[PDB]
Design a protein around this ligand. Structure first.
Ligand SMILES: Cc1c(C)c2c(c(C)c1O)CC[C@](C)(COc1ccc(C[C@H]3SC(=O)NC3=O)cc1)O2
Ligand SMILES: Cc1c(C)c2c(c(C)c1O)CC[C@](C)(COc1ccc(C[C@H]3SC(=O)NC3=O)cc1)O2
Lengths: 132, 139
């Protein structure tokens, strides 16, 4: 089931991502650089360890994690958060928490695409990736 | 020490570029990296980006060979997939002023010591007596 996600994925469309970063509290200059980037997302599994890398001109990131186990993460916009990632309706669902706030990032397969739905306080961004 | 800013870390915080490399092929040979992969890894000259946010330390390495990133607390064991795809248990401490990382997997172990020496960050990697040395300076 994790293998539905394993691979290299290139970004293909992006909707409401600006509004979403705005709720998150990302600054103006960062919001415009991040918005132009068009990153790859790479997913791998080594045993019970999952790795998501994201790569672009803006920033290279990587989280390594076990499903269902809280871990510390520094996001690309520099929030220090607690994340838990679960497999949930066949989707990887990540909840990020910091300073009383939370955001949910859902990665789900739909046809040959990987759809990423980030939500915070009503504002939903959608980003679609295809295989490389 | 060596050092630094306000913390004993912060001697390490910044962006570093590879400046020289020694016995790195041999080091990789002892670790079990395959012939073809060693050629690509050995020619790469990576940048190393170290940062701190609270108790969390991050070491990023970036090149055409691979982009990796570890996040960790000092003195706390963590799981790590290395650049050459070993899955290891890793512990990193501040010891004689150096960042000393031990990686354990399949009964084996290696030690990466990251130290300051003048304006250089010097990385020494040891596996069964074979030691490699890689020198970095600030970008
Ligand atoms: C700026 C920003 C990003 C990039 C972000 C998230 C948030 C909350 C952000 O404020 C959540 C996950 C996610 C929506 C995951 O899907 C991605 C979307 C954009 C990017 C572009 C930048 S951010 C990163 O880690 N690597 C990149 O190349 C990567 C992954 O990444
Ligand atoms: C291939 C490989 C690497 C790169 C490696 C180590 C091993 C055991 C390796 O098999 C140990 C630490 C160390 C010697 C630390 O210093 C580095 C030297 C080269 C590189 C080049 C590649 S590997 C990476 O994560 N990013 C890069 O750009 C990174 C770090 O990195």
């Amino acid at each position: 089931m994790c293998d539905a996600f394993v691979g290299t994925w290139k970004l293909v469309s992006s909707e409401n991502f600006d509004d979403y970063m705005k709720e998150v509290g990302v600054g103006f200059a960062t919001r415009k650089v991040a918005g132009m980037a068009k990153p790859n997302m790479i997913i791998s599994v080594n045993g019970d360890l999952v790795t998501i890398r994201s790569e672009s001109t803006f920033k290279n990131t990587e989280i390594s994690f076990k499903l269902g186990v809280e871990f510390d993460e520094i996001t690309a916009d520099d929030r220090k958060v607690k994340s838990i990632i679960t497999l949930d309706g066949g989707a990887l669902v990540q909840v990020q928490k910091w300073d009383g706030k939370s955001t949910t990032i859902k990665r789900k397969r739909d046809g040959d695409k990987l759809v990423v739905e980030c939500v915070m306080k009503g504002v939903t961004s959608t980003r679609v990736y295809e295989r490389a």
